[PDB]
Amino acid sequence: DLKLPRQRVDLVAPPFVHVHEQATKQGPKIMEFKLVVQEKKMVIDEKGTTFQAMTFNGSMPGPLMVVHEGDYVEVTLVNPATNTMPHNIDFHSATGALGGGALTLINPGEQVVLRWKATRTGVFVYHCAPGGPMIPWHVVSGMNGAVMVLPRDGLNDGHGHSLRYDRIYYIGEQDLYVPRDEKGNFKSYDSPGEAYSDTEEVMRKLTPTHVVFNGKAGALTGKNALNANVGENVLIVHSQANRDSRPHLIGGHGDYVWETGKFSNAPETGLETWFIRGGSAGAALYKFLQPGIYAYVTHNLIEAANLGATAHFKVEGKWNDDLMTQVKAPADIPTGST
Amino acid sequence: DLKLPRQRVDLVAPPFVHVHEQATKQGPKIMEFKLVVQEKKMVIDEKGTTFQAMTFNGSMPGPLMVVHEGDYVEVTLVNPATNTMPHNIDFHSATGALGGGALTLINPGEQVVLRWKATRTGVFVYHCAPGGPMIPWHVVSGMNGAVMVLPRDGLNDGHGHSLRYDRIYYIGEQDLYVPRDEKGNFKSYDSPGEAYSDTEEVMRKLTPTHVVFNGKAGALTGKNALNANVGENVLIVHSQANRDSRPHLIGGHGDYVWETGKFSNAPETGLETWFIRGGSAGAALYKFLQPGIYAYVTHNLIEAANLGATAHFKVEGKWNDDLMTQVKAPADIPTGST
Amino acid sequence: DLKLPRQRVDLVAPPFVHVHEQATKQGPKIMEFKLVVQEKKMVIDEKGTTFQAMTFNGSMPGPLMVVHEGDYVEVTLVNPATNTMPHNIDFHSATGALGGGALTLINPGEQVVLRWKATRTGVFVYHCAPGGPMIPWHVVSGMNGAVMVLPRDGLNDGHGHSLRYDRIYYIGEQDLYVPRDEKGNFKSYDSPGEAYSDTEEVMRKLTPTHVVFNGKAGALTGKNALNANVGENVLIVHSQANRDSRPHLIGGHGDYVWETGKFSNAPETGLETWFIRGGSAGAALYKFLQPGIYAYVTHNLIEAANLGATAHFKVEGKWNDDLMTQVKAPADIPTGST
Ligand SMILES: OC[C@H]1O[C@@](CO)(O[C@H]2O[C@H](CO)[C@@H](O)[C@H](O)[C@H]2O)[C@@H](O)[C@@H]1O
Ligand SMILES: OC[C@H]1O[C@@](CO)(O[C@H]2O[C@H](CO)[C@@H](O)[C@H](O)[C@H]2O)[C@@H](O)[C@@H]1O
Ligand SMILES: OC[C@H]1O[C@@](CO)(O[C@H]2O[C@H](CO)[C@@H](O)[C@H](O)[C@H]2O)[C@@H](O)[C@@H]1O
Ligand SMILES: OC[C@H]1O[C@@](CO)(O[C@H]2O[C@H](CO)[C@@H](O)[C@H](O)[C@H]2O)[C@@H](O)[C@@H]1O
Ligand SMILES: OC[C@H]1O[C@@](CO)(O[C@H]2O[C@H](CO)[C@@H](O)[C@H](O)[C@H]2O)[C@@H](O)[C@@H]1O
Ligand SMILES: OC[C@H]1O[C@@](CO)(O[C@H]2O[C@H](CO)[C@@H](O)[C@H](O)[C@H]2O)[C@@H](O)[C@@H]1O
Ligand SMILES: OC[C@H]1O[C@@](CO)(O[C@H]2O[C@H](CO)[C@@H](O)[C@H](O)[C@H]2O)[C@@H](O)[C@@H]1O
Ligand SMILES: OC[C@H]1O[C@@](CO)(O[C@H]2O[C@H](CO)[C@@H](O)[C@H](O)[C@H]2O)[C@@H](O)[C@@H]1O
Ligand SMILES: OC[C@H]1O[C@@](CO)(O[C@H]2O[C@H](CO)[C@@H](O)[C@H](O)[C@H]2O)[C@@H](O)[C@@H]1O
Ligand SMILES: OC[C@H]1O[C@@](CO)(O[C@H]2O[C@H](CO)[C@@H](O)[C@H](O)[C@H]2O)[C@@H](O)[C@@H]1O
Ligand SMILES: OC[C@H]1O[C@@](CO)(O[C@H]2O[C@H](CO)[C@@H](O)[C@H](O)[C@H]2O)[C@@H](O)[C@@H]1O
Ligand SMILES: OC[C@H]1O[C@@](CO)(O[C@H]2O[C@H](CO)[C@@H](O)[C@H](O)[C@H]2O)[C@@H](O)[C@@H]1O
Ligand SMILES: O=N[O-]
Ligand SMILES: O=N[O-]
Ligand SMILES: O=N[O-]
Ligand SMILES: O=N[O-]
Ligand SMILES: O=N[O-]
Ligand SMILES: O=N[O-]
Ligand SMILES: [Cu+2]
Ligand SMILES: [Cu+2]
Ligand SMILES: [Cu+2]
Ligand SMILES: [Cu+2]
Ligand SMILES: [Cu+2]
Ligand SMILES: [Cu+2]
């Protein structure tokens, strides 16, 4: 019945994004994606703490899917027989059937195929939602990602000017609720099911033990810092499926920010810190003006520095002393100071 | 002195709203409302937990009052002699005297009459505020509601087009702080006064034990699901007098959202999740496009599924397979899969 | 090299602000400021609780710095030898080198001079950020303030009309994490270093023990209430370097609010409650219409009334009975009531 060209997309692991066009003159297509659920123990912090994760495609977050307004998105969701739990998928981008969750519940050993029309532009969360208390548990166990639905003319500033990014990164932020023993040490389990009761008790007190980008403390620091160059316009897509976040690029700004994440609304300009509502994605464009290290954080600095929520950008280029300069290096306070 | 026609309004219990006009050619009126304080033990969760509530008109939230810009609102607040505490009322819609709280403190056995001019359009919180620590306690005990002040021309999209709703619902969200004994069981008390000291200790740690719509977990699910039909534009007014919330309609969107709740500002379009600041009301319009069950949640999914904060809509109509379809029902994974 | 006139500014303690022009016909200048770090024990609540604070210029918050777009800001940061820790400064208004933190780390007995160009309009946080876990600790110990970068034409309403304030106040909100002993009493220490380990444990649970304006519970109440007059337009700058806040003027509104704090964006109009993202500053203009006491709060009322986060305005003038009136004072409920 639906007689449109089909295009298969190969997803890539965050924080990278699969190849796509911004502006397009192609007409609507059926864009075909595959997501495979993987339950596995994962390391989440720099001390080696593990937890029983549940993921789309083996990553936290799940991969970013990119389509254009008016495309149809045909998703095959696979739940391999090595998994222990039923899973499904809910797209905040989609209309009807609890975002697709009501049509995608699959037991281990099954797959399902859902199609949804991309009628709404923006970045949106997708997440597992099997029913009842399983909804938060699967989400906070890692089963969430995002999809971006671009206008066919690409982004704009809300005032009739096109905006084009040179690079895009997807930062998925995850709140984790890891059980502790009586002495405060994190507990380990042999399966997600075995971890559930203790995990739910932590969840109920609404205070995460970890808040991480790309699935673990330090994931996007060191050798996995995000690269850019002076003069490049970088789009940073940020999602949080369960809990608020307040992104901030230390030493930079958000030149154009869609904090609610929807491109039918004009972006705000020149922000210091923006706000991602739990259960949403947002996006910020920034043109780098200075080289060096930048930290990208949630600006609850306790979370950023002590719970895991810091990424780095490493930016190549020449320093601009007009924008900022050290006039006088650290020196002893003059004795003739009052 | 104030020589305007008077109109008595009969309030109704949430989530319904008293009859009113959207656009009106009537001139300003004195709109007369009565609120009666009721202290009573109420069931707040599906396991039968009770707590010592304090309410306007016997409901959590208090009823939605609806007037138009330039009306005067004359409120009789009654504190029956069966109550134990003084009470008052503060309208975030009103100008002066702490929103009216400074002019409305009444002991049991007393009533008071306040008039305020509706100079500011939007949805606004009202709440009790007797003074000092009694302010949070009365609010988190249930003494809060909302008022909507419509433009006389009804709603608009901020771009010169009228917006009209077919149905309106008022969802009041309440954070509750129920004491526990040493084993974790909820405690019961014979009066609000007896509950206070233990309740304040819970309040101080800023983590609710329950987060509910319309006064209890499950209030707006099952047989009390909210009704709508495909094609209807539904206005959902959401308030939270004390704590942030992040509303989301699962399987839908916010077509037009005033998250800060004030109709002098253009709405945002096509949101997935919006944000109600503690101490405010907001509103979202959505035109249903698909039949079925929708869950309306705060998108902290722990709160939604585990603390009580889920409502349902039941939407009648015909399914649109263009917007979404199950291409292939759950099936075994092909053996020839890699 | 940089051949512009230099102007020395003398800062004043919050909530007041140093003298400045709104609109200016002056060209760009090098605006010279000095900040001196002071570590000291400070009283933070009405029961006399102390804590080991770290401050810019002896105050929490640090002073508000005011410049215009295109000015250069040359800041001398001094760390006296009586201090125990290294300190630095990061300006969210500045571009590069982690906002200046990477160029300003000074040991006790040293000073440093940083210059940054004010290319972005708005109110912005500045804070200490020495590295790693020291970042949140220094911030939540008091080392944060704000800077305002005005357009050279002053404020506007986003619709081509100038806005001018008669008075400005800077409200810095601080979340504090004071250790308790086994019985719940707050602990005291002889130095910041000695307090660190216990303080970090509190910080990790993300629940403050105190939330205060201008450095202590009750700071801006009583004889230190903020003054205004009916008819005056008052700008209230609000910052929070670490944690969200939801400001509300009880009995008033935000006539024009920049909740994200950046003057390149049009303000929202007629708000009840607004939202300051942790790691940002915002600003609200209000024209007082009624005399009397107003409370300015974060509208988590537990925080406001029980954790310290209430300020007062005392407004002189004549009451307007058109806006609000007590029609009938408290009286016994008529016996002939049903
Ligand atoms: O012996 C505990 C010690 O070993 C580490 C190794 O990096 O991790 C082990 O214990 C953790 C806490 O139970 C587990 O999460 C992990 O699975 C296990 O290898 C340290 O983290 C831990 O302190
Ligand atoms: O708005 C994007 C997209 O949403 C649809 C529904 O699929 O329209 C919705 O939003 C419109 C514009 O705000 C409303 O007028 C409409 O009533 C509502 O369903 C699409 O038609 C539109 O392209
Ligand atoms: O956090 C409480 C308490 O637990 C201990 C071990 O007894 O440390 C645990 O908690 C730390 C904070 O989350 C982690 O850094 C560490 O991995 C974990 O074992 C104590 O060191 C701490 O006081
Ligand atoms: O890119 C940052 C990196 O560049 C160096 C020189 O290679 O210094 C530049 O950046 C500094 C600010 O971070 C400037 O103060 C300096 O003048 C400029 O040359 C490195 O020192 C720095 O890490
Ligand atoms: O015996 C405790 C058991 O009875 C229930 C009945 O539904 O409720 C009682 O105890 C609760 C906890 O103290 C009270 O809140 C309630 O008022 C009382 O009827 C169960 O909830 C409870 O577990
Ligand atoms: O704005 C709605 C309503 O507020 C009033 C005061 O009651 O005006 C306020 O807002 C105006 C427009 O933003 C400001 O110009 C004014 O100074 C401020 O008092 C009413 O006059 C107006 O209808
Ligand atoms: O929550 C702690 C602990 O308390 C128990 C009873 O000892 O359950 C209580 O708490 C549950 C979570 O809020 C409620 O579902 C129940 O109504 C309440 O009695 C334990 O079951 C739980 O481990
Ligand atoms: O309204 C939802 C309700 O309708 C039924 C048929 O009565 O199925 C419709 O809705 C489904 C999605 O929820 C579609 O997949 C189906 O094709 C459509 O007919 C019920 O199965 C469903 O609960
Ligand atoms: O004896 C404790 C008692 O004295 C007070 C005096 O106002 O403060 C003392 O103890 C506090 C808690 O340790 C300290 O923070 C403070 O430095 C010290 O003077 C009371 O607050 C306290 O309850
Ligand atoms: O926007 C204020 C200020 O920022 C600068 C950079 O210092 O420009 C940024 O914002 C512009 C307008 O949004 C973008 O076009 C530009 O690419 C970005 O660097 C200044 O040029 C401008 O005055
Ligand atoms: O808060 C727990 C518990 O501690 C006590 C003293 O044992 O009070 C402390 O905590 C109160 C709340 O923060 C403070 O008002 C007071 O300054 C502090 O000593 C108990 O009174 C309270 O139950
Ligand atoms: O400014 C508030 C202050 O003024 C007084 C009279 O001096 O009363 C005025 O304000 C009241 C509302 O707060 C009005 O009801 C009254 O009519 C008006 O004269 C004081 O009573 C009040 O504290
Ligand atoms: O599908 N839930 O475990
Ligand atoms: O300025 N960053 O924390
Ligand atoms: O009026 N307060 O309990
Ligand atoms: O998509 N709702 O959780
Ligand atoms: O400089 N840090 O303690
Ligand atoms: O209306 N103020 O809490
Ligand atoms: Cu799942
Ligand atoms: Cu969702
Ligand atoms: Cu009350
Ligand atoms: Cu209020
Ligand atoms: Cu410092
Ligand atoms: Cu910062």
Side-chain angles (χ1 to χ4, degrees), chain A residues 1-2 4-338, chain B residues 1-2 4-338, chain C residues 1-2 4-338:
Chain A
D1 209 352
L2 214 208
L4 290 174
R6 284 169 171 282
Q7 178 176 337
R8 193 189 89 247
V9 175
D10 295 315
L11 292 164
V12 310
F16 305 101
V17 178
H18 68 81
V19 296
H20 61 278
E21 297 179 283
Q22 294 167 238
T24 188
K25 293 296 189 61
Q26 310 228 54
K29 291 193 175 168
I30 301 163
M31 306 295 297
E32 301 171 326
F33 296 84
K34 185 174 278 180
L35 291 174
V36 182
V37 179
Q38 189 173 26
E39 304 166 9
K40 50 169 167 181
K41 183 182 290 205
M42 297 181 80
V43 176
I44 57 170
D45 75 22
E46 299 172 294
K47 296 181 182 184
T49 303
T50 62
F51 95 117
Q52 291 290 158
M54 303 192 292
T55 70
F56 297 111
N57 275 16
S59 56
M60 289 190 280
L64 189 68
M65 299 166 51
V66 184
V67 301
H68 291 83
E69 188 177 6
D71 285 339
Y72 293 80
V73 184
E74 193 166 288
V75 184
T76 302
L77 182 69
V78 184
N79 188 3
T82 46
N83 293 326
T84 63
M85 299 293 153
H87 299 284
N88 67 348
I89 191 164
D90 277 10
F91 282 94
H92 287 187
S93 48
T95 302
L98 303 172
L103 294 174
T104 56
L105 191 66
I106 46 174
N107 292 318
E110 295 185 324
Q111 63 183 45
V112 62
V113 184
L114 176 75
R115 185 171 57 220
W116 55 270
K117 192 177 185 178
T119 58
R120 306 292 184 148
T121 63
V123 291
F124 298 84
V125 166
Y126 66 79
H127 65 83
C128 187
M134 300 297 96
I135 299 170
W137 183 47
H138 284 235
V139 175
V140 304
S141 295
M143 296 203 67
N144 62 89
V147 53
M148 183 163 69
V149 179
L150 287 167
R152 287 195 176 280
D153 292 344
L155 300 178
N156 72 66
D157 72 350
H159 302 285
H161 313 113
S162 290
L163 296 172
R164 176 172 192 281
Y165 48 92
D166 298 301
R167 298 195 190 238
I168 179 176
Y169 296 113
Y170 172 35
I171 306 303
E173 176 179 329
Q174 185 63 58
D175 50 317
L176 301 168
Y177 300 85
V178 182
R180 295 169 193 273
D181 70 13
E182 264 308 317
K183 288 196 136 68
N185 301 296
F186 294 121
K187 295 179 63 168
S188 310
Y189 303 90
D190 289 338
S191 67
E194 289 166 278
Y196 175 67
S197 183
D198 289 352
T199 300
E200 185 282 335
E201 296 174 355
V202 185
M203 290 162 64
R204 181 166 292 281
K205 291 178 77 79
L206 305 175
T207 305
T209 57
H210 302 76
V211 181
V212 300
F213 300 147
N214 215 56
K216 63 173 294 178
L220 303 177
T221 66
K223 72 169 205 66
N224 291 318
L226 305 175
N227 290 311
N229 297 289
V230 170
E232 288 178 348
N233 207 15
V234 178
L235 188 72
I236 309 166
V237 176
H238 196 116
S239 73
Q240 227 297 6
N242 191 60
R243 185 176 181 264
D244 303 326
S245 181
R246 60 214 55 73
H248 175 96
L249 182 62
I250 305 177
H253 296 91
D255 285 336
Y256 302 92
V257 183
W258 299 263
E259 75 173 22
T260 51
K262 307 300 166 286
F263 300 140
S264 59
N265 302 289
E268 292 174 277
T269 54
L271 300 194
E272 70 188 302
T273 299
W274 43 109
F275 189 68
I276 308 301
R277 296 141 187 71
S280 73
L285 281 163
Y286 182 62
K287 177 184 304 170
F288 282 101
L289 304 176
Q290 294 278 37
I293 196 91
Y294 297 67
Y296 179 83
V297 298
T298 182
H299 213 294
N300 184 312
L301 298 172
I302 304 167
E303 299 180 26
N306 298 348
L307 281 65
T310 296
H312 289 167
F313 287 78
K314 285 180 182 185
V315 183
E316 288 191 320
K318 282 183 179 168
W319 180 261
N320 181 347
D321 282 300
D322 188 58
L323 286 173
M324 181 179 288
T325 199
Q326 191 188 64
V327 175
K328 201 141 190 297
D332 289 354
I333 299 165
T335 67
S337 285
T338 157
Chain B
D1 209 352
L2 214 208
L4 290 174
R6 284 169 171 282
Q7 178 176 337
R8 193 189 89 247
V9 175
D10 295 315
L11 292 164
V12 310
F16 305 101
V17 178
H18 68 81
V19 296
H20 61 278
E21 297 179 283
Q22 294 167 238
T24 188
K25 293 296 189 61
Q26 310 228 54
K29 291 193 175 168
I30 301 163
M31 306 295 297
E32 301 171 326
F33 296 84
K34 185 174 278 180
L35 291 174
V36 182
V37 179
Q38 189 173 26
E39 304 166 9
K40 50 169 167 181
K41 183 182 290 205
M42 297 181 80
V43 176
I44 57 170
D45 75 22
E46 299 172 294
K47 296 181 182 184
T49 303
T50 62
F51 95 117
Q52 291 290 158
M54 303 192 292
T55 70
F56 297 111
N57 275 16
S59 56
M60 289 190 280
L64 189 68
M65 299 166 51
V66 184
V67 301
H68 291 83
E69 188 177 6
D71 285 339
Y72 293 80
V73 184
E74 193 166 288
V75 184
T76 302
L77 182 69
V78 184
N79 188 3
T82 46
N83 293 326
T84 63
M85 299 293 153
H87 299 284
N88 67 348
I89 191 164
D90 277 10
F91 282 94
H92 287 187
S93 48
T95 302
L98 303 172
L103 294 174
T104 56
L105 191 66
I106 46 174
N107 292 318
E110 295 185 324
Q111 63 183 45
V112 62
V113 184
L114 176 75
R115 185 171 57 220
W116 55 270
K117 192 177 185 178
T119 58
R120 306 292 184 148
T121 63
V123 291
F124 298 84
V125 166
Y126 66 79
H127 65 83
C128 187
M134 300 297 96
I135 299 170
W137 183 47
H138 284 235
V139 175
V140 304
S141 295
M143 296 203 67
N144 62 89
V147 53
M148 183 163 69
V149 179
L150 287 167
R152 287 195 176 280
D153 292 344
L155 300 178
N156 72 66
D157 72 350
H159 302 285
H161 313 113
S162 290
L163 296 172
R164 176 172 192 281
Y165 48 92
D166 298 301
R167 298 195 190 238
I168 179 176
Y169 296 113
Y170 172 35
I171 306 303
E173 176 179 329
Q174 185 63 58
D175 50 317
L176 301 168
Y177 300 85
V178 182
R180 295 169 193 273
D181 70 13
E182 264 308 317
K183 288 196 136 68
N185 301 296
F186 294 121
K187 295 179 63 168
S188 310
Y189 303 90
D190 289 338
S191 67
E194 289 166 278
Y196 175 67
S197 183
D198 289 352
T199 300
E200 185 282 335
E201 296 174 355
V202 185
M203 290 162 64
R204 181 166 292 281
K205 291 178 77 79
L206 305 175
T207 305
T209 57
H210 302 76
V211 181
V212 300
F213 300 147
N214 215 56
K216 63 173 294 178
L220 303 177
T221 66
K223 72 169 205 66
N224 291 318
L226 305 175
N227 290 311
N229 297 289
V230 170
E232 288 178 348
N233 207 15
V234 178
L235 188 72
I236 309 166
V237 176
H238 196 116
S239 73
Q240 227 297 6
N242 191 60
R243 185 176 181 264
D244 303 326
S245 181
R246 60 214 55 73
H248 175 96
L249 182 62
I250 305 177
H253 296 91
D255 285 336
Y256 302 92
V257 183
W258 299 263
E259 75 173 22
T260 51
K262 307 300 166 286
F263 300 140
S264 59
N265 302 289
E268 292 174 277
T269 54
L271 300 194
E272 70 188 302
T273 299
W274 43 109
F275 189 68
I276 308 301
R277 296 141 187 71
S280 73
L285 281 163
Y286 182 62
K287 177 184 304 170
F288 282 101
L289 304 176
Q290 294 278 37
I293 196 91
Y294 297 67
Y296 179 83
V297 298
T298 182
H299 213 294
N300 184 312
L301 298 172
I302 304 167
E303 299 180 26
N306 298 348
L307 281 65
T310 296
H312 289 167
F313 287 78
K314 285 180 182 185
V315 183
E316 288 191 320
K318 282 183 179 168
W319 180 261
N320 181 347
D321 282 300
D322 188 58
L323 286 173
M324 181 179 288
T325 199
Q326 191 188 64
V327 175
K328 201 141 190 297
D332 289 354
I333 299 165
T335 67
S337 285
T338 157
Chain C
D1 209 352
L2 214 208
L4 290 174
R6 284 169 171 282
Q7 178 176 337
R8 193 189 89 247
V9 175
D10 295 315
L11 292 164
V12 310
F16 305 101
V17 178
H18 68 81
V19 296
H20 61 278
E21 297 179 283
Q22 294 167 238
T24 188
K25 293 296 189 61
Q26 310 228 54
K29 291 193 175 168
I30 301 163
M31 306 295 297
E32 302 171 326
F33 296 84
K34 185 174 278 180
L35 291 174
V36 182
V37 179
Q38 189 173 26
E39 304 166 9
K40 50 169 167 181
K41 183 182 290 205
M42 297 181 80
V43 176
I44 57 170
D45 75 22
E46 299 172 294
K47 296 181 182 184
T49 303
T50 62
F51 95 117
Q52 291 290 158
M54 303 192 292
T55 70
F56 297 111
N57 275 16
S59 56
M60 289 190 280
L64 189 68
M65 299 166 51
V66 184
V67 301
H68 291 83
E69 188 177 6
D71 285 339
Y72 293 80
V73 184
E74 193 166 288
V75 184
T76 302
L77 182 69
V78 184
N79 188 3
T82 46
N83 293 326
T84 63
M85 299 293 153
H87 299 284
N88 67 348
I89 191 164
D90 277 10
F91 282 94
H92 287 187
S93 48
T95 302
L98 303 172
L103 294 174
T104 56
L105 191 66
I106 46 174
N107 292 318
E110 295 185 324
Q111 63 183 45
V112 62
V113 184
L114 176 75
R115 185 171 57 220
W116 55 270
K117 192 177 185 178
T119 58
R120 306 292 184 148
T121 63
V123 291
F124 298 84
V125 166
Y126 66 79
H127 65 83
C128 187
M134 300 297 96
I135 299 170
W137 183 47
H138 284 235
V139 175
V140 304
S141 295
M143 296 203 67
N144 62 89
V147 53
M148 183 163 69
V149 179
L150 287 167
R152 287 195 176 280
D153 292 344
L155 300 178
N156 72 66
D157 72 350
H159 302 285
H161 313 113
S162 290
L163 296 172
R164 176 172 192 281
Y165 48 92
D166 298 301
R167 298 195 190 238
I168 179 176
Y169 296 113
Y170 172 35
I171 306 303
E173 176 179 329
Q174 185 63 58
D175 50 317
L176 301 168
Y177 300 85
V178 182
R180 295 169 193 273
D181 70 13
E182 264 308 317
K183 288 196 136 68
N185 301 296
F186 294 121
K187 295 179 63 168
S188 310
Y189 303 90
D190 289 338
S191 67
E194 289 166 278
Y196 175 67
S197 183
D198 289 352
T199 300
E200 185 282 335
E201 296 174 355
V202 185
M203 290 162 64
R204 181 166 292 281
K205 291 178 77 79
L206 305 175
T207 305
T209 57
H210 302 76
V211 181
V212 300
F213 300 147
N214 215 56
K216 63 173 294 178
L220 303 177
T221 66
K223 72 169 205 66
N224 291 318
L226 305 175
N227 290 311
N229 297 289
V230 170
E232 288 178 348
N233 207 15
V234 178
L235 188 72
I236 309 166
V237 176
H238 196 116
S239 73
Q240 227 297 6
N242 191 60
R243 185 176 181 264
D244 303 326
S245 181
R246 60 214 55 73
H248 175 96
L249 182 62
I250 305 177
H253 296 91
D255 285 336
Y256 302 92
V257 183
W258 299 263
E259 75 173 22
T260 51
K262 307 300 166 286
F263 300 140
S264 59
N265 302 289
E268 292 174 277
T269 54
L271 300 194
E272 70 188 302
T273 299
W274 43 109
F275 189 68
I276 308 301
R277 296 141 187 71
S280 73
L285 281 163
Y286 182 62
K287 177 184 304 170
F288 282 101
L289 304 176
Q290 294 278 37
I293 196 91
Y294 297 67
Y296 179 83
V297 298
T298 182
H299 213 294
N300 184 312
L301 298 172
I302 304 167
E303 299 180 26
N306 298 348
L307 281 65
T310 296
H312 289 167
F313 287 78
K314 285 180 182 185
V315 183
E316 288 191 320
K318 282 183 179 168
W319 180 261
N320 181 347
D321 282 300
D322 188 58
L323 286 173
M324 181 179 288
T325 199
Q326 191 188 64
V327 175
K328 201 141 190 297
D332 289 354
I333 299 165
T335 67
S337 285
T338 157

